[model samples]
Target: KTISVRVTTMDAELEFAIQPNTTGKQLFDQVVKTIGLREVWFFGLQYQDTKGFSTWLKLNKKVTAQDVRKESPLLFKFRAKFYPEDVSEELIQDITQRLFFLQVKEGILNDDIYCPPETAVLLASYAVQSKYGDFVHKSGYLAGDKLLPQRVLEQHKLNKDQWEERIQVWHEEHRGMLREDAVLEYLKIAQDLEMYGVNYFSIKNKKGSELWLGVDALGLNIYEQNDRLTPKIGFPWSEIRNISFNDKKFVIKPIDKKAPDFVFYAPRLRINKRIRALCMGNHELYMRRRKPDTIEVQQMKAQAREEKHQKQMERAMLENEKKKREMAEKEKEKIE
Candidate 1:
């Protein structure tokens, strides 16, 4: 039997036709092909389970076996699952960088990624430069809606025009910057935020207090429900011995003998499963990132750098040719 799956990406929504028994990897491969993304390891396709918690598709499992909602037109989100420690240094492809840019922008606007008011204005400026090249003093050039989250805008003491003026002034300093460079700058700043790559899940502690469990490349973090920007507790991968869950009760074992195990409870079984899976994936990636690059990865990096060098040389040659022609034209005009 054929099933219809709709995958929402950074730029657009894509629909795929596949068999009920199709592996998640097969569908993911199709999505990656459509986007022409070479760096595929950092991303995954996520779908909501019946309990309404987000779960990553198990690439090795059949689509039907994952307990995905059987509703006609299955919906999934293709997103960055693993974020690098240093975006500018680790990410190889421009497309990968752009994907991160789009994801971070959405995360900020959606209030998933948290930043300070001043940092928000700066990030918005880079976003403006990326979209419009340089800042032009056009009336209503950018509405507050275009650059920042409504919550952030409302919380700030500055008026709409004042924020716009600040962003415009910052944008003016980015003159002659390329679109991709501007996006890179934006990511560079964003990566330092406390909640930059955190995936937060609402849960309760052993004492039944509502808290947020944040999982990222570094480790598992706990944030108070009211304050998500600062983590109250952190368990780095090095300290984590094992993570396991029984139904809704999740437990974390640390390496220290004196320290007690960290325990929390999710609201539902599905959320617990998601938490476990994310912890596993994030921990694995964290360990991998610490090691030196594999031979294959090293070769891939070398190849990409060579291609960039070739492109830069071609651009320089074209610029020289244009300058020579302009000089010749000027000499002719003077002689005449």
Candidate 2:
């Protein structure tokens, strides 16, 4: 029997029918192919586990075997499961960058990722430039747009017009910029945000102080609930040698011989597993970024370039064909 699945991407919802025995990789390939995404390593199909926590579908396991919702149409979200150390340096394709931009934009707007008030205006300006080239004197362009989070906007003294004026000034400076370049700039600026790629989980330290454990590309960090912007303590991936957990107790081992191991207690066993997986994955990516690209990645890059050139050639040929057809019709009209 075949299982119908619906995958939600950055821009659209795509439906697919596949055999029950199909692996996650098979569905992932179909989704990426349909979306024209070439860089496949950084993304995955995410689904809700039985406990309602978001989890990435294991590529090696059968699709149905995972605890994905057993509804008539299995639902999954295709998004960036892993982030590159640097967007401009590591990301190659325009589509991949756009996906990152869309995801981050949504994150900021939906309050999943926090942005400062000052930075929020600046980021919104870049968003406007990306969608609409230069700042034009058009009314109501941003009227219904939720560029900044509601909570952030309410705390500011500026009125609607005042805020747009500031955003316009920044947007005007980004003149004659391509949409892709604007997105790249937006991401570059956003990358510096305190919570840019940090995934937060509520946990307690050894001292029994309530804190939030943040895992990101850089390393592990602990943030106070009141102040999510700055971390109270940090552990870089290079500093930590190992991570282990027992039930709800999680521990981080430092490489230094004299330094003590960092220990924290998660709220639940499931959350501990989640934190461990994120830390391990982030650490692996962190280490991988320091080394040179493998031959497989190098080949993928070359192949992507070739495919882009072929697509451009195809578009050019189609344009030429349309022009010829138009010319023939004009000639016929003149003869008549």
Candidate 3:
């Protein structure tokens, strides 16, 4: 059989690399055909010919085989939200750091509490989705005692030493950004398209102290809507939810609604604009030491806060008045 001379634009098509002795054209054709299967994926596939097939058949358009060869390569030049594994050594660290900081900002982690293992990993996954959205995540989970990220990286031939090298590169690239989610697992999972789902929460045990919990097995338990009461979360789909603990010593049970028990809170941490700015090579104290003449700014702030509190109170009062009127009208009708 004669081989079709096809050119592929994307370097990353086909299930595996082309075998030796196979022409590039053959490889392109196979990938295009496979793409026609219409699988749900982040990236799309395309094909182009130098001359229209109809024109070529009618001999109306003069076409050269050289032109076809020139355009035969398959193209993978689509927008792909890659995982941490597929990214360059320099970029993974920078992105991971940013993603982590976002997670912290979003309250995925509580500094005052001890975080659980599964929750930490799942939080890492959630950070990726939050920053990049639905696609920039790697595939794999710790299974049968194997760390998920570790196992997955092995498949890609990225070992500990290379991982450390990536860290050094990121330090140089990101500098001082106060990024939160720069941990290893987050970096690895954000690249793979084959995986999804992550969720995090915290609860207090009968014994004092807090635990960070996360679940991302079978699917992303980021959100749920069980019994028409639970909220819906996106990604890493799983049922009934799976939660992990940093320290595996939690006592699980029901809590009393009257004076409910657990109190989990993160200390209020503020980034002074001046201190943060110092990281950018500007050491001048950005925190303005105000002179007593700044009564105007203080007054404005106080007035604004008072107005907000008054509005809240007004809303509550209005609600109460409406309920009272409703009760009185009903009672009058009953008397009649």
Note each model's CA RMSD in angstroms: 2.7, 6.1, 26.9
lDDT of 3 by residue, 227-335 (tens): 1113243222212122222232221112333422222221111112211211111111111221232465456446546865786788689989999999999999998
Q: What is the lDDT of residue 162 in candidate 1?
A: 85
Give a tens-digit lDDT track for model 1, residues 161-263: 8888888888889987778789899999999998888888899988899999999888889998898888899888999999877999988998998999988
Give the Å shift of residue 32 in candidate 1: 1.1
Superposed Cα deviation of residue 257, candidate 1 (Å): 3.4
Report how far off residue 220 is in candidate 3 (Å): 38
Taking all chains together, each candidate's TM-score versus the true structure is 0.88, 0.85, 0.21
Q: Rate the local accuracy (lDDT) of all candidates.
A: 0.87, 0.86, 0.32
Question: Which 10 consecutive positions of candidate 1 have the poorest summed lDDT?
Answer: 135-144
The lDDT of model 2 is 0.86
TM-score of 1: 0.88
lDDT of 2 at 292: 89
